[PDB]
Amino acid sequence: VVGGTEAQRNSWPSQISLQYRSGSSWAHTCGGTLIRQNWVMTAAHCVDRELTFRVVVGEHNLNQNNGTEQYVGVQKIVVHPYWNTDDVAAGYDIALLRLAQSVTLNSYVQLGVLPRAGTILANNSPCYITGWGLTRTNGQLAQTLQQAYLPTVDYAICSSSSYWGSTVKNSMVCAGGDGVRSGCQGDSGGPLHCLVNGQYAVHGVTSFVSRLGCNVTRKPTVFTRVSAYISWINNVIASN
C-alpha cells in the first residue's frame, strides 16, 4: 500500500497473509480474506506458481511475534475456471483456498463480510485497501499492516479513455487513482473494505495496477468485484 497509514491491530481481522516457503523460511506474497473458518478468498494470480503456501491469520507485523498469529497450510486451491494467467484484464482473478485446519475466531481473526450478489457501489464510495504490499513503486513490503483510503471510481469513469479504457470490466471495482495512494505488489489478493449501511464489507479482491507504477493518477487500483462471484463462491464451498 502506497500512501497508507499503519492499521490498528484489531481493525481488519479478516485480512490474512498468504506466504510461500522460500528456503528455510516463509515469505509474504499476497493478501487474502478469511471467509470461512477453513476458507480464504484471494486472487487467482497469487496462486499461479506451483509453490507451497500457508495462510497466517491474526497477523500484524510480518517480522515480529504479535502473540496473535495462527499458521495453517493450504490444503486445496480452487481457481475460477475462467481465469487466464495471460489475460488478467479479462477478469476472473479470484481463487478460494481450503485450509488444512479451521482457524479459531477471536478479536484478531474474524470472517470477512461479503456484499449481496450484484451490488454495485456508487461513484466515490468510501473504502479502505489493506495489506503488507510495497509502500512505494518498486519499493519494499511493509512490516506492519497498512491501510489507505481509496474511494471507488465507477465503471463509467474507470473505463473511460483517460483511465483504464477497455482494460477494466464491469466484473471489477476501481478505487483510488489520486496519484498518491494505491495498492502495490504484495497487496494482491487482499481486501477492499467498503462501508455500506454502517457495516464494512469486502467488495474487492486486489487484482492489478498500472505497469507504469502503483500510485499513478487516473490509474486507480483494480479489484475483482466480489459481488459478481457470490454464487461461484457458495458453489465451491458447498462442493468442497
Binding site: 488478467v88 504484495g186 497487496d187 487484482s207 505497469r211 502503483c214
Partner: peptide
Amino acid sequence: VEPX
C-alpha cells in the same frame, strides 16, 4: 495490466 500489472497483477499485484
